[model samples]
Target chain A: MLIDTHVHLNDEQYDDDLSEVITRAREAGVDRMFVVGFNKSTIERAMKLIDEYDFLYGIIGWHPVDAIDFTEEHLEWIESLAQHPKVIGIGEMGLDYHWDKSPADVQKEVFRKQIALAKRLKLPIIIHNREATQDCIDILLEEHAEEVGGIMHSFSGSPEIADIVTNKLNFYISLGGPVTFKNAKQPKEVAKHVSMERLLVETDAPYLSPHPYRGKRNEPARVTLVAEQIAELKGLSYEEVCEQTTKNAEKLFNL
Target chain B: MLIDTHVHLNDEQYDDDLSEVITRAREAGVDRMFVVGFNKSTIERAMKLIDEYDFLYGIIGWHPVDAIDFTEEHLEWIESLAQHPKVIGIGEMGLDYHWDKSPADVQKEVFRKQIALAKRLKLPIIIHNREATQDCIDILLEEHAEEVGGIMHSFSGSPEIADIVTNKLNFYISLGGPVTFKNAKQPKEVAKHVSMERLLVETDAPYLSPHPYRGKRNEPARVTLVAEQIAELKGLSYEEVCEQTTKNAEKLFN
Candidate 1:
C-alpha cells in the first residue's frame, strides 16, 4: 500500500469525520500515516488519534509559526511527551518569513532548541520552512540538525537550497499536494533529480491536497494520488512506488 | 518565472497544439523550456521548433533505447551535431533494462560510444536510467563520465545511489513527477537529501504527466507542477525553485 509521510489527523478540519477519514485512507490502500502534532494541545489530540489506530503514528513539535509565545515549560512538556513510544520525530518546526506571527529570531531560537532536543532524544525531525531558505539552511547547519536527520516538510526552496539541506544535513525532502498543482515546475525538477530512496510522501491533510481535490480539505486517504503521480513520473509501477516509500517511512520512523 | 529543464517540443504529441502549449506555459509563468531531440528526425524537428520559439532551446542525442540499430555513422552524426550552438548536451541516453527491445551488449556499446563522444566534445551527458542503475553507474565511472558531468534523468534508485551519482560522478539527479507520488518514498527521501544546485527539472512530456493529469499526455507546460511540488517539499518558495533549477539547467546545457 502507501505510507503518507506527513499528515495532520488531529486538525479540527478532520474533527467531525476523523474515523471516516482514516477509514477512507485505509480503503484507498494507505497502509500507514504519520500524524503530526504542532502544539501542546494538538499533541494530546494526536496521541488520542494514534491510540485509536494501529497504523497511525505521531510526531510532536512546536511549529515555527506557533513558537512566538513558547516557554521553557512548553519545551519541557514536549520533551516529556517525546518519550512516549508513539512519538517518532521532533518537529514541524523551523522558520517562516511568509507570516509575521512569530519573530524570526524567536523562531530560530525555538527551532534550534527543538533540534537539540531531537538530537538528544536520537529522533529525526520534521521541518516546516517558508520564505526563509537562507535562514533555514543556515540555522539547520549551525545547529547540526543533520545529527538526527529529518524531513523538510513542504520544501519550497531552490534546487541549490535543496542541495544544501540534503547534502549537508542528510534531510529527506517531503512533498505534499502542491506538487500536483498545474502551475508547478521546481517540484517537478526536484522530483526528476532527487533519488527515490531518500524521498517520502505526505498529504499534509486538511491542507494541500493533490489535484482534483486541490481546493477541498485534504485527508490522509488522498496520498494515493500523490503516489500515482510519482509512479508515472519515474515510469514505475504504482505498487513499486508504494512499497519503496512505505519502507522509507518505516525506516525513518523506526516503525 | 518557471523553466522546463527537460522537454521534447519535437514530439508528435505537440504537433497540433505546440504554439498553444508554449503560450499556455508562458501564461503559467514558464519563461524558458529545454527542447531535447533523441534522433535525427526529431533533431530536425527540434531545430525548427527552436527557430520558431525564442524560449525553446535544444539538446541532441540518440537515446540508449534506440541503440540497437544505431551504427558508427550515428555516433558520427551525434558528434557532428554537438557543434551546433543550441545543442546543449549529448543525451537522453544511458541504459534501459526495463525495455529489452535492444540487446544489452548493443546498448552498452552504444552507451560507451556516446560517452566517448561526449568526452571528446567536452559536453555533458543527459542520462535516462530505467532499471539499470548499476550498469549505468559502472559505465559512467569507467568512462569517467564525470569529466563532463550530467544529469541522471528520472532517477529511481536509493539514497546511496544518489550519493554515488552526486559525489563520485558529479552528476545531478533530475527528478520528474514521481517525487510527488505518495508511494515514491525513496525519491521523496532523495528529494530531501539531494543538493538543489545539482538538481534539474524535466517534463518528459507525451509520457509521464504529474497528478491530475497522470493518465493524459504531458507537455512542457506541466513542468511547473513538478517544480511547485518540489518547492512544497523543501519548504522553499516557487521562485527559488525556479531560479535555482533554471540556473542548474543553464550551467549544464550551456
Candidate 2:
C-alpha cells in the first residue's frame, strides 16, 4: 500500500466527488492520504474530512506565498489545531517568487515564524519552494530547521543540494506528478538521486494529474502513477517504491 | 570532433600503444584528450605528453586515494604548472572509499585544500568519486567548489544527484566506458538524464574500457565509443554530443 503524503483532499476541486475520490484512491491501493490545509478555511475543511474519514490524516500550516495575510491569531489557531490527534505537520511554507504574492523578505519572515513555531511545538513542517531555492535553503540553515526537520514539497533541485539539506537539516523530499512528465527534468532527476528511504511520493491532489491524466482533474488515486514513474527512473520494482515510500511516510508522520 | 576530457596517455600501459592510440583517436574523431597526472611521476609523464602532442592538454593533482603523498611543497609545484598553457584543471581528486589507501577524513582534507587552490588560481577541477558519493559532494559543497567548477570524472551516480552538483556548483558530469554496460544502471541513467551542455565523454584510459572493449586495456581512441553510447542514450546527434562536449571542454578549461 502507498501513502499519498501531500493530497489536498480539502480543496474545492474535490468538493463534489470527495467521497468517490477517496473510494477510488482506496480501490487503487492508496492506503492513506494526508489532507493539507494551509489556510483557515482549508484547515476547517481538513478537520471535517479527518473527523469523517478513518483513513484521512491532516497537515495544517500557513501558505508561504500568501504569508502577508498571516497574523499571530492565525498562528494561535494553527497551534490549537496542532493539539488534535491527526494534525501531522506545520506547513506548505517557504518561498515562492513566481507568484510574488508577498515580498521575499516578508515570505521569509512568515516562513521563519512558522519554523520557530514548529520548533517550540516539536512538530515537523512541510516546505514549498519555487524559484527561490538558495534563499529557502539559507533560511532553513540559519533557523536550524534541521532540529525539527520537515519535508521539501515538489523538490526540483539537484541530488547534491538535496543531500546537503537532508544531511544538514534532516529534510525528506516529496515528489508529485512532475516526475512522470516526460519533459520535466527536475523531478525525474530527484527520483534517481534521492535515497529512497528518505523520499515520499505525493499527489498534490485535486491538481497536477499524472501522464495519461495530465492537465485534467486529479485525486489521491493518481499518486500511484507518480510512484510507478519514480520506480522506473530509480530502477526499482514498482512494489519496491510502494513499500519503501510507505515506510518513509509512516516514519516521518509517526503513524 | 570530440574531446576526451580525461585520459592517461601517461599510464605507461599506453607506452607500447602510444602513437597508434593517438592516430586512431584522431581517426575516430576524438581530436583532443586531457592527460591527467595525480602524483609526482604521473605529472612528469603528463607534461611529456603535452609537450610532444599538440592536441594533448593536462590536468594534474594529488589523487585523493593517495592523499598520504600530498604535501605543502607539492602544491607549490602544481601551482607553478598552472602557468603552462596546457594545464587546465586541478584534479582527478575527491573521495574514494573503494580504495583503502587513504582514510575519508584525510581524503576530504586534501580535497578541500585542492579546491581552495583551484579557486585561488581560477582553474576548474576534475573530480574522482568511488563509493563515496555523499561525502564527496558534501565536502565540495562545504568547500564551495562551484567558485572554480569542474568535471566529475567517470561519474557513477544517478542523474538526479548529478543535477544537484551541476546546478548547485558549476560541475560538468562526464561518463566513461561503464555507461555502455548493460546493467550499469547508474551511469546509463546519467547518460540519459544530464543536460548535453553540462555533459562530457571521457575515457579513464587504461581502465574501465567501454563495451566490446570491456576487460581490455582502454585507450583515448575509445572515447568516441563512449560518446556513441551517450548519443544514443541522450537521443542527440552523435555530432551534437561531440560538438557540445568539445565546446563544454573549451568553456571550462578557459
Candidate 3:
C-alpha cells in the first residue's frame, strides 16, 4: 500500500464525509496517511482523528503563513499534545516570504523556536517554504537541524536545490499533484533526480487535487495519482513506486 | 591572524626545519593550522606535532588513495587517539577516483566506516573528493554525514556543488593554492560564489603550491597567498578575509 505522507484530514472540508473519504483512500490503495494540523483548531481535530483511525498519523506544528498568531501558550499546548503515541513529527513550520502576515524576522523567530522544540523532543521536523528558500536554508544550517532530519513538504524548488536538501540535510522531498501538471517543468525535473529512496508522495488533500480532478476538492485517494506520475517520470513501475514510497514513509515515521 | 585550515606539516619534507617553517608561518600572520595526517606514519607525526606546538591541531584519518592499506587496527588506533584534546575532526577520508590504488568499492567502504566513527564521536569530518563527486555525495547523503557537518578540503568543484555542501551539509569549503592559479576556472568560480562565512584557506603543504611557488615545496605560511587571492575574487580586503576565514575554521573544528 502507498503512504500519503502529507494531508489535511483534519481540515473542516472533510468533516462531513470523513469516513467515506478514508474508505475511498483505502480503496485507492493509500492505506496509510499522515495528517498535519498547523494551528489550534486544526491541531485539535488532528488529535481526535489520529486517536480514532489506526492508519492516520500526526505531524503537528504552527504554519509559517500564520506565524504572527503563534504564542507561548500555543507552544506549551502543542508540546503537551505531542506526547501522543501517534505524533510522528514536528512542524509544517518554516519561512513564507510570499505572504506578509508575519514579518521575516518574526517568522524566523517562530521557526527557530519550533526547531529547538523538535530537537529537544528528539523528533524529526516537517518544513514549509514559500519564496524564502535562502533564509530557510541558512536557519536550518545554523541550527544544525540535520540531527533530526525531516521532510521538505511539498517541495517546490529546482533539482539542483533538491540535491542540496537531499544530499546534505537528509531530507525527503515529497511531491504532490503538481508533478502531473503539463507545463510544470521544475517539479518534474526534481522528481527525476530524486531517488526513490529519498522520494515521498502526497496530495495535500482538499487543496491540490491531481489532474482530471484539478479545480475540485482533493482527498487522500488521489495520492496514487501522484505516485503514478512519479513512476512515469523516473521510468519505474507503479507498484515499485508504491512499495518503496510506503517503505520510505514507514522508515521516516517509524510506523 | 589567519588559520591555514589544511596543511601537510606532518610530511617528512618539514622534518629538517619544522620549527623554522612554523616560525615563518607565524611571521606571515598565519597563527593556527589544522595539520591532517591520513596514514600510519603521517598520523603518528601529526600526533607528536600537536603535543609540541601550541598552534597545531589534528584531523586524523585514512586517505582514500591508500584505502587498500587501511586495516581494523588503524581504525582502533585512530579511535583511541581521537580522545586527545587536540584532535578536532575525523578525516581526509573520502573517495579518490583519479587514482587506481584502491578499487571504488573499497574506498567507499573505508569512507563509510570513517563517517560512522565521526558521528559516534560527535566530531566533524574532513572530506577529500577527486573526480568521484557523485558517488562521494551519494554516500554522504545515505550515511547522514551532516549530523556532525565537515569540510570539503581543497574544494575544486563548481560553485553549484559547493552550495550543496555548504548550504545543505553545513560544510566549510577550504580552498588551497590552486585558487591562485591564473587559468583555473572552476575553483575560481567556486571561490567567488562561496561566502566568507563558509569559506576557509589552506595550503595543502608540500603539494599544490600557490602561483609564484608553483611546483615548489609548499609550506603553511603561503596560505596567506590563498587568502589574498580569495580576497580579490570576493572583492574584500585581505584582512577581512583573514578574520572571517579564521573564525570559520574555529567554528567548524569546534
Candidate 4:
C-alpha cells in the first residue's frame, strides 16, 4: 500500500497513456497518488481525475513562477474549491528564481497569500522550492506555516538544510529520480540523513523519470525505482521502506 | 553629509566614550549614523541616543536571534514607534541560522511580521542576515519586500548572492570590517561588483573592527576604514566612494 505523494498525472505528457500509467502504478504497489494542479486548467484536470479515479487526491494552486496572475477574486474562488472532500491540500507554491517569468516580488506576494489561505483553510501544503531554498524556508518560518504541515517535493538541499526543514519547518522531504543519480552528492546525503517519519517518495512525473528510464518521460509507476533507491541508500529492506514511506505519506496527506 | 548606514552606537561598549565616539566619527568625516536596537532595552537605548544626539538616527526591532520574546504587545508598541521622526527604518531583523539562541522558526516568524509592519508604515527596513543566505533571500523575495527598499548590513554572501539581493530585493549592500581583512574574497567582490548607488559603509561596532584596529573595540569613526577598503576594491577615489555611498544611504533611509 505505497503512495506516490507527488505526481503530475494531469500533465499533458500522460494524455496518450494515462490509463496504462495508472495501471502500472497500481501494479507497482503504489495504491494512491496526489495529482497537483498549478493553474486553472490543471486544477480542472485534477478535479476530473479525482472524480474518475478513487485513488487520486488533489493539491492545487497557482504556480509561483506565474503567481503574478493571482488576484483577490482568484483567492476567493480557490477558497470555495477547498470545500471538495477530494482536495487534500493547497500548494505547488513556493519560489523559483531560475526563471524570471514572474518577478520575485509578485511571486513572493502570491506565495505568502496562498500560505495564508491554506492556514485559514487548515490544510497541508505541498511546497515547490527551486534555487530559492533559504527564502522558501524563511517564508514558511515567518508565515508560521507549521500550523499545517507540508511536503518539500523533490528536495535538493544538503543534509544541514534537510535538518532545518525536518527539525524546524515540520515538512517531509519527498525524493524523486534525482536521488538515484550517481553523482548527486546532496540528495544522497539527504536520503541517508533525514528521519524515516519525515521522508516520502514521489515520481514528480511526467518530469524526472528514474534510472534506466532516464531521459524518457516519468510516470507514477517509476516511484518503485525511487523507493528502491531510498531503501538501498538507507540500508533498509525494500518491503520495510515501502511500508514506512507509505505510512509517512498517509499521515501527511491523511489518505 | 556622509552617512554611516549601520553602527552599534547603542551597544554598552560605547557607554563610556559615547560622546567621544561621536566626535571622532564627525572628525573622520562620518557626520550621521544609524543606531540599531533589537529587544526592549536596546530599543530604549537607541531612542535615548536619538534624543541626545542631533547626528544620530534609529533603526530598531526584535533581533531574530532573540525573537522568541516577541509578542503581540511588542508588535503594537513597535508599530507606534513608526511615527517617530528619528526612527529611519524597521529593522536589524532577518534570519540567523548560525546561533542556537532562538530557534529558526521563531526567528523567521519575527522577521516576517516586522517586514509587514515596515510595509504598513511605508518605511525602509534594515536587514541583518547571518549565515542563512538562502532562506533570507527567499523570504525577502516572497514577502514583496522590495516595495519599501532596504539595507543588507555586514553582508557575508558571495557576489552571486549580492546580485540577487541588489537586483531582486532592491537593497543597498553595507560592508563593515570583514571587507578590510586580507584574503577576503566575497566581500571584496561585492564591493567591486555592486553599483556605487547600491553600496554603503558601516562600522557594525563595537564589533568587527577594521585591520590595524583589528581585535580592538570599534566605533562609527572606523566606518571611514570600511569605505576606504571599498574604494580600494572598486578602484574608485576614496572621496568618490564616500560621496556616492553617502548619497545612497541618505536616499534609502529617506
Candidate 5:
C-alpha cells in the first residue's frame, strides 16, 4: 500500500466528485492520504473531510503565502485545531516568490509564526519553498525550525545545498511527480545521491501529475507512478519504494 | 560544439585508441574536454595528454580518497602544476566513506589542504562527495572554500539542499551519465531546479557511461548521450544543452 504524504483534498477542485476520487485512489493502492488546509474555510472543510473518511488525515496551517493579514488569534485557532486526532503536521508553510501575491516581509512573518507554532506543538511541518530560497533557508535556520523537522515539499535545488538542509534540519527530502518527466535531470541526480533513509514520496495531488497523465488534473492515485520512478532511479524494485516511502510517511506522521 | 567539463582522457583505459576516441568526440560535436588527474602518476599522464591534444584541458589534484598520505611537498607540487595554462581546477576532492581504503581523517586533511591550495591559487575546486555529506559541508563552510567556487561533480542530494549550496557557494552542478538512467530521479530533479547558467555537462568518462553504453568503457564521444538526456529534461533542444553547457564550461575554465 502507498501513502501520499501531500494532497489537498480540501480544495474545491476535488469537491465535484470527492468520493469517486478517494475510491479511485484506494483502487490505485493509495490506502492513506494527508490532506492539508491552507486557510480558515479550508481548515473547516478539511476537518469535515477527516471526520467523514477514516483513511484521510489532516494538516492544517496558514500556508506562508496565504498567511498575510494573519494575527495571533489565527495561531490560537490553529492551536485549538491541533487537538483533533488526525492533525499530523503544522504546515505547507514557507516562502513563495514566484507569485507576488503577498509581500516578502509578510510571508516571512507568517512562516516564522507557523514554524513557532509547529515547534510548540511538537509536530513536524510541511514546508513549501518556491523562488525565495535564501530567505527560506535563513528563516528556517534562524527560527531553529529543524527541532521539529519537516519535509521540504517539491524540493527544487542542487545536491550541494541539499546536504546542508538534510544535515542541519533532520528533515527528509520529498519528491513528487516531476521526477517522472523525461527532461527532469536534477531530481534524478538527487535520487541517486540522497540516501534512502532521508527520502520520501508524495503526489501533491490535483497538481504535478506524473508523466503519461501530465497536463491532466492530478489525484493521489498517481503516486504509484512517482514511486515507480523513484524506484527506477534508486535501482530498487517498485515494492521497495512503496514500502520505504510508506514507512517514512508513517514515521513522520506518527501513524 | 560542446565542452565536456569533466572527463578522464588520460586513463590507460583509453590508450589503445585514444586518437580515435578524440576523433569520434570531435565528430560527435564535442569541442573540448577536461582530463582529470587524481594522483602523481596520473598527473604526469594527464600533462602529456594535454600537450598532445590542444582541445584537451587538465584539472589535477589529489582525490580525497587517493591522497591519504599526501605530504606538504605534494601540496607544493600541485600548486606548481596550477600554473599550467591548460590546468583549470583543483579537484575531484572531498570525502568518500563508501570505500574504506583510506581513513576519514586522512581524507579530511588532504581535502582541506587541497582546498587551501585552491583558495591560495584562486582556482575553482571540484568536489566528489560520496556518502559523507555532513563532513563535506562542514569542511567547505569552515574552510571558506567557496571563495573560489567550484563544481559539485556528479551531485546527488535533495533539491531543497541543492538550493543551500548554490546560494552560499555559487557552485555549478555537473550531471554525468546517471541522469539518463530510468531510475535516476534526483539528477533529473536537479536538472529542472538548477538554473541553466550554473549547470554543466560531463561524462566522468571511464566511470559513469550513459545508457546504451552502460557497463561498457566510457569515452568523451559518449557525452552526446548525456547531452541528449539533459536536453530532454530541461525542455531544451539537443543543441541548446550543448551550447549552454559549453558556455558554462568556458566561463568557468577560461
Candidate 6:
C-alpha cells in the first residue's frame, strides 16, 4: 500500500470536496495519509478528519513562521491533543528563516520546545525546515532528536545534508512535488542521492504540487507522481518505490 | 584605572608567584581583574582568590571542551558558588569546535544550560567561541543571551561578526594580547573597527601573550599592552582606551 506520508488534508482548499479528495487518493493507491496541522483551526480540522476516517492520521504542531503566537497555554493544548491515538507525531516544527514574520530566536525556542514535547510523548516529529538548514540540524543534534527520529517533510536540502539527517539524525528524507521539477537541481539531486531505505514520498498538498500539476492546488492523490519521480531518479521500479516508502512511513509513524 | 577584563590568574603557571603577578598588574595601572575559572579545581581557586583580593572578580562556568564531564552535581556546585558577592558573571562557556574532546551537541547543550544559569542569577556571561562563529552567535540569539548581555572574551572574529555580537547580542568585543601582535590581521582590524565604548582589553594569561612577551608566561600586567595596541589602531590615547574599556567592563559586569 502507498502512503502519502505528508499532506495537509486539513487545509481549507479541500473543504468543498473532502470526500472526493480522499477517494481520489485511495484510487491512486495511497491507502493511508498523514495529515499535518500547524495551527489552531487546522489542528482542529486534522483531529476531526483523523477520527472520521480510518485511513487518516495526524502530525500536529505550531509552525515556525507563526512561532511568536505560540504560548505555554498553546503548548499544553498541543500536549493534551497529542494524547489521542490518531495523533501519531508532534511537529511540522523546525526553523523557518525564509519568512520575516517570526524572528529566528523565537522560532528556535518554539522548535526546541516542540522537540521536547515529542520526546515526552514518545512520538516521532515532522520537521519543516526552510532556508535555515544548519540551524535546524544543529538544534536537532543538540536536542538529540534522534531519540524519537522523524521525517524532514518535503526535504529540499543537498545530498550531503540528506546523508547527515538520515544516517546521523535518524530522520527519513521526504520528497515532495519539487523532485519532479525539471529546473530543480537540489531536490532532484537529493532524490537520486538518498537511498530508498531512508526515503518517503509526500505531496505537501495545497502548496508544492507535483510537476504536470504545477501552480495548481495539490491533493494527496498526487503523491504517486512524487513517488514515480523518485523511482525514475533512483532507477527503481515505481512499485518498488511505493512499497518501500510506505513501509518506511509506517515504521516511522508506527501506523 | 585599567581593568584586565579576562585573565587566567588561576592557572597553575601562576602557582609560584601569584602575588608578584598581582603587584605587576597594579604597577602597570591595571587596578581591577576578572578571573575566569572553568572547572572544579579552578573554580575553587577562583572563589578563594576573589575573597582574598579586593580587586579580583570571578566569571565561572563549565568549559565547552570538557562538557562531557559536566553533571548535575557540577551545575549545582557552580550555581552555589555563583552566589558569591564577587561572582559577577557566568561563562567562558560557548562552542569550541577546534577541539574534538566534546561533540558539538554536548557543547551546545552545556552552553545553553550555562546561559540559563546566567539569566537566573541575573549575571552577564563571557563567551568563548573558537572556529564556530555562526553556531555560537545563533545559540546566543536563540537563548536570549542579550537579556543579561555579555563579553565575547578574547574575540577573534571578523569586524562584521564583531559588530553583530556587540550591536545585536549586547556583547562587548574584548581584545586580548593577540591584538598587540603586528601580523594578527583580524584582531587588529577588530580593535580598530570596534568602538572603545563597546570594547574591552584582556590578557588570557599563561597563553596568548602579547608580541614582545610572545611564547613566555603571560600575566595580567600585559593587559596594558593590549590597551596600547587598541590606542594605536584606533588613533586614540593610551589613557583614553584604558578609561573607556574599564568603564565598559564595569557596566557589562554589573
Candidate that scores best on lDDT:
3
Docking outcome class, model 1: incorrect
lDDT of 4 by residue, A1-255 (tens): 688888889988888899999999999889999999888888889989998999999998888877878889778878898788989899899988655457677888999999999988889999998767887888999998888999998998888888888888888999999887753456778999998789999998988787878789999989998888989989998898899998887787755
Name the lDDT value of residue B216 in candidate 1: 83
Candidate 5 achieves a global lDDT of 0.84
Using lDDT as the yardstick, the better of models 2 and 3 is 3
DockQ value of candidate 1: 0.02
Q: Give the Å error, residue B197, model 5.
A: 22
Candidate 3 lDDT score at position B188: 81
Q: Please report, in order, the local distance difference test score of every candidate based on alpha carbons.
A: 0.81, 0.86, 0.88, 0.86, 0.84, 0.87
Candidate 3 chain B, poorest ten consecutive residues by summed lDDT = B180-189
* Native contacts retained by candidate 5: 0.00
Pairs with steric clashes in candidate 4: A108-B142, A134-B134, A134-B135, A135-B134, A135-B135, A135-B138, A135-B139
Tens digits of per-residue lDDT for model 5, B1-254:
88888888878898898899889999999989998988888888998988888988889898876766677887888899889998999988898865545778788889988888998888999999986766788888899977989998988877866776788777888989888765455788998898888888889988878887777898888888988988888899998888889888878776
* Colliding residue pairs in candidate 3: none
Per-residue accuracy of model 6 over B184-232 as CA lDDT, tens digit each: 5567788878877899888989788886888789998988888888888
Q: Which candidate is the best by TM-score?
A: 4
By summed lDDT, the worst window of 10 consecutive residues in model 6 chain A runs over A179-188
TM-score (chain A only) for the predictions, listed in order: 0.96, 0.97, 0.98, 0.98, 0.97, 0.98
Tens digits of lDDT, candidate 1, A105-141? 7888999899889988999999888756777888888
Clashing pairs in 2: A158-B164, A189-B160
